[PDB]
């Protein structure tokens, strides 16, 4: 075997370097000759497809000819009794050897982005799990807003569970040998959770607007039941509107190239000649930008009514409802702002990718990072804003 013969060569050169008697150099040089010729008879893994008389093979064997020649000279010098000269011949032998070893056999930014995505993966999983459990095991926190935020927490959870393949595709993009079903599956799930997140935030804000401006809400926003129905329909629309991903993306390779070397997970050719790519990009583009408009107007009205200008001489109180509504509306406002701010470069970059598919680095990387930074940052914002959430977490752990 080539590996066995090579380890044998390095071993006996190691002996020669640390051998005092000339006899030891004689033996080690003889065995190095034997393993050198035996290795020369063997075929390297990089030249097995080429014919035996191919030029590459003749070079690979030529280097071995030079090698065995040096072993012959060193063997003669060792037979004389000159240990120093034979060791020097073993040194130049090591030189030619190493040369033909290395001849026939973004990264820091990758480490940074990957490490950060791992941090957001840990803090994300733990944070959103703590959110769902806090809503689970406490009466005074089973409000409607906490239910919508719990569905959002699960959506972040599933997004982070989809992160690994997205990161593998982030650095390892030349080959995709994982399969077609995965290439469609993880992006389908990720997009579905995107739609569920945006629709859940929008439904939550609508419920706050109707709750504050129209106190007839007691009949309308009924109970947890309505919230469970809206969550069900939100996830159903997320899955159906993200269905076409199964046709949009796929694995493809060039004509005349090895599939194991040129397979990629990208929008298919049929997904481009028919504007399924542009159609889907405009679908999610509406799915993000339109609810951004709705959130802006709705929170504008909520802030207009709650934070209304009052004459300083006001003698009547504050009604004790606008206080709690100001708390939860503060929290939700910060959450929505972080959402838009984080997923804006993502949808911007996807728009640029769609428009470029019809004839930089830190932009795509910062979008990749921000996308998960939202999912990880929502529980942190819950811990900072809501005192009840903080008390519930500290009550669960300590």
């Amino acid at each position, epitope marked *: 075997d080539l590996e066995d013969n090579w380890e044998t060569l390095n071993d006996n050169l190691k002996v020669i370097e640390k051998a005092d008697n000339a006899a030891q150099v004689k033996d080690a040089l003889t065995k190095m000759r034997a393993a050198a010729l035996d290795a020369q008879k063997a075929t390297p893994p990089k030249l097995e497809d080429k014919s035996p008389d191919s030029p590459e093979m003749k070079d690979f064997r030529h280097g071995f000819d030079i090698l065995v020649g040096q072993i012959d000279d060193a063997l003669k010098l060792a037979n004389e009794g000159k240990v120093k000269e034979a060791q020097a011949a073993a040194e130049q032998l090591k030189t030619t050897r190493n040369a033909y070893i290395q001849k026939y056999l973004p990264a820091p930014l990758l480490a940074g982005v990957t490490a950060t995505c791992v941090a957001l993966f840990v803090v994300g999983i733990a944070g959103n799990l703590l959110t769902m459990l806090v809503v689970s095991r406490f009466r005074e926190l089973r409000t409607t807003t906490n239910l919508y935020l719990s569905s959002m927490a699960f959506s972040d959870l599933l997004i982070f569970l989809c992160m690994p393949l997205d990161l593998v595709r982030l650095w390892q993009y030349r080959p995709w040998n994982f399969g077609d079903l995965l290439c469609k599956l993880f992006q389908f799930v990720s997009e579905s959770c995107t739609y569920a997140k945006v629709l859940t935030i929008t439904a939550l804000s609508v419920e706050r607007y109707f709750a504050i401006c129209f106190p007839l809400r007691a009949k309308v926003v009924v109970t947890k039941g309505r919230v469970k129905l809206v969550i069900f329909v939100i996830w159903a629309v997320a899955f159906c509107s993200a269905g076409p991903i199964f046709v949009l993306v796929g694995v493809e390779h060039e004509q005349g190239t090895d599939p194991w070397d040129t397979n990629e997970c990208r929008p298919t050719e049929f997904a481009v000649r028919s504007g399924l790519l542009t159609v889907m990009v405009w679908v999610s583009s509406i799915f993000f930008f339109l609810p951004v408009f709705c959130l802006t107007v709705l929170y504008s009205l909520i802030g207009r009514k709650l934070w209304r200008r009052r*004459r300083g*001489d006001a003698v009547v109180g504050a009604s004790l409802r606008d206080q709690n509504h100001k708390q939860t509306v503060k929290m939700l406002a910060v959450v929505v702002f972080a959402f838009i701010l984080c997923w804006l470069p993502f949808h911007v970059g996807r728009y640029l990718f769609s428009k470029s598919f019809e004839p930089s680095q830190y932009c795509n990387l910062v979008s990749f990072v921000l996308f998960y930074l939202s999912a990880a940052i929502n529980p942190i914002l819950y811990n900072i804003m809501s005192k009840k959430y903080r008390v519930a977490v500290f009550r669960l752990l300590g």
Partner: antibody
Amino acid sequence: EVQLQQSGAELVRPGASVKLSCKASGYTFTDYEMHWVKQTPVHGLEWIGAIDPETGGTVYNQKFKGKATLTADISSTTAYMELRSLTSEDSAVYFCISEDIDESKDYWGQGTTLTVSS
Amino acid sequence: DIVMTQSPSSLAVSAGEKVTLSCKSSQSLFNSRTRKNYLAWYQQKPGLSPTLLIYWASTRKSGVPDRFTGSGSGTDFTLTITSVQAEDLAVYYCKQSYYLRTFGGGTKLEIKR
């Protein structure tokens, strides 16, 4: 232009009740507070109470507590004051005052004359 | 409850002459948070409703002639008319806004002819 139209004069029998009105026009009815002032020749200007039309919360003076009841309707943009257990001391000139957000501006009505006698 | 007391009750003066009215409160009307003395001066002419002249006890409402000048702090306030005119025939009240509300006894201004 901001204008407040109060109710006409009232001649109420002693012991009965009455409810005065104050029709506000020319501004956002929910933004400005609505106060009520009782004017008598003996006691001068007496502050009855105030009400916020958006929340409905009221506040009264310790003297007119229970005597007066301030209400408000947003669809009609009209304030009301109910006076119960009327006597001759209640005969007076009642004003409604919309207090602008700008503390330099306030708006008075023409006044309602309450005469209570058998 | 804050009680207001004005002085004098009745005051006669000629045309163009100076006039000084006083409004004393039973409690300080200074809000240390807003740094404003919530004290207003109203002019009620006979047959009409009171109109605002001075708010914050030193700030003149837009449109009011500059001859009306209110001053004072704490519990003592004044309304000064530098050049009284025949149009100034009215009763001047002072309303506090520190607590709920309270008007003063009023001051009837009569001009001499």
